[PDB]
Amino acid sequence: MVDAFLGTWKLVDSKNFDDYMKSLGVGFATRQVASMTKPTTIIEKNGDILTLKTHSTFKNTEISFKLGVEFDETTADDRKVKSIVTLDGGKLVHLQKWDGQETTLVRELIDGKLILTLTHGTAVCTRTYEKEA
Ligand SMILES: CCCCCC/C=C\CCCCCCCC(=O)O
């Protein structure tokens, strides 16, 4: 199920993150710092509650959720959203809704790497994470 996603992951590639942030209305100064930040993402489970931590030198976030149960979230860029995370096709799909807008954060495993695809508007960003021991 979710088990192969669990652990500590480090950013090792990023494509079109500025486009994604700009689509969300993130200001230039934040985008600038974010473009040079390499987060660590930690995914943990306790029974069927998942906790997803994102740690960096700039912004930190943490969310806890049950798969398939909506939760309130305040994102790194300070959007207050209604969220749900589900497994779909073996991918961990995180959908955020606010003001009639939506964005998806889709995680999948390819060759042992965690590929995060972020879509908002027409912007599609692909971030690659590798596992840490
Ligand atoms: C997490 C470090 C940079 C974040 C700075 C805030 C700017 C934009 C937030 C966009 C939504 C969250 C993106 C997460 C990207 C990721 O987990 O690699």
Curated annotation (Swiss-Prot):
Any one GO molecular-function label of the UniProt entry? long-chain fatty acid binding
- Function field: FABPs are thought to play a role in the intracellular transport of long-chain fatty acids and their acyl-CoA esters.
The record's listing under InterPro entries reads: Calycin, Fatty_acid-bd, ILBP, Lipocln_cytosolic_FA-bd_dom
Keyword set includes Flavoprotein: no
SUPFAM superfamilies listed in its UniProt record: Lipocalins
- The gene behind this protein is FABP3
Instruction: Classify the main location.
Output: cytoplasm
Instruction: Name positions with the PTM N-acetylvaline.
Output: V2
Residues with the Phosphothreonine modification: T8, T30
Entry-annotated residues carrying Phosphotyrosine: Y20
Top-rank taxon, per record: Eukaryota
**Listed name of the protein:** Fatty acid-binding protein, heart
Q: Which parts of the sequence bind (9Z)-octadecenoate?
A: R127, T128, Y129
Q: Which organism is it from?
A: Homo sapiens (Human)
